[PDB]
Amino acid sequence: GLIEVERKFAPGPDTEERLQELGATLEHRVTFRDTYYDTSELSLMLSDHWLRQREGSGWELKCPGVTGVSGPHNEYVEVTSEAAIVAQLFELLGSGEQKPAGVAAVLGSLKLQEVASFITTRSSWKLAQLTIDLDSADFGYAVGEVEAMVHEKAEVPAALEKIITVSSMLGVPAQEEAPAKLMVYLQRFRPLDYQRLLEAASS
Ligand SMILES: Cc1ncc(C[n+]2csc(CCOP(=O)(O)OP(=O)(O)OP(=O)(O)O)c2C)c(N)n1
C-alpha cells in the first residue's frame, strides 16, 4: 500500500476561514463508525500496527513507516488489500501456515477483539495535493490532520515540508502535537490499555 504522511492539530473557530483563504476546497462531509481490533495483550498496537474496520471503506491496516519522520508528525503504510492485511496478521500474531481467508473470518483464530468503536463526523478538504480532515468524535473530542499520500520514500521529505507549511499557515502552534481520536478514546474508556501504551512509549 501507500505511505501516509500526517500532522495532527487542534481545530479553532477560524479554521474554515483559514482553509478558505489558503485556497483549499471543502470536498465532502461524512459520518462513519471505526472499529479497532487487537489481542488482549495489545500485540498490534504495541508494535505500532493499527487494524480497523471502517464503515463505508472496509478493512485497513496501518503499518509503521520506513523513514524517520516522527515528532508532532508521523508516517504509516496503509494496507487496504484484505489478502495483504491477513498476510501481515499471520506473520505478527499467528503462523504463515494458516489458511488465508477474509479479515473477519480470521479474527477469532488470531484472538483479535474490538478494543475501540466510535463514530466520527469528518469535514474533508483538499489543497492543490494535501488533504485536511476536520473530525469530531461521538465521545466528545475534535481534531484535525493535514495529510499527504505518496508512493515512494523519496517523496516523503517534500510531502512532510508542505504539511508543516500548511499547519503553520493555519496558525497551529509549532509545539502542539494533538492526540489521535483513538488515543483519547483509550485514555477515557480503556484506561488499562492506555497505561500499557504509556509504559511502553517511555519503555
Ligand atoms: C503517542 C502516539 N500517538 C500516535 C500514534 C500513532 N497512532 C495512534 S492511533 C493510530 C490509528 C488511528 O490513526 P488516526 O490517524 O487517528 O486515523 P484517522 O485520522 O481517523 O483516519 P485516516 O487518516 O485514515 O482517515 C495511529 C496510527 C502512536 N503510536 N503513539
Numbering used by the authors: 4 to 131, 141 to 215
Quoted from the paper:
The Vtc4p β-tunnel domain is not unique to eukaryotic polyP polymerases but is a structural hallmark of triphosphate tunnel metalloenzymes (TTMs), whose characteristic features are the presence of a topologically closed hydrophilic β-barrel, the preference for triphosphate-containing substrates, and for a divalent metal co-factor (PFAM families CYTH and VTC). Members of the ancient triphosphate tunnel metalloenzyme family can be found in all kingdoms of life. Our comparative analysis defines that most of these enzymes share a common catalytic mechanism in their tunnel centers, yet they have evolved different substrate recognition modes on their tunnel entries.
We thus structurally characterized a mammalian TTM ThTPase, which was previously shown to specifically hydrolyze thiamine triphosphate (ThTP) into ThDP and Pi. We synthesized ThTP from ThDP and produced co-crystal structures of mouse ThTPase with its substrate at pH 6, where ThTPase catalytic activity is minimal. Our substrate-bound mouse ThTPase structure supports an earlier docking model of human ThTPase. The unique modes of substrate binding in ThTPases and adenylate cyclases allow these enzymes to carry out rather different reactions and to produce different leaving groups (ortho- and pyrophosphate, respectively) while maintaining a unified cleavage site in close proximity of metal binding site 2.
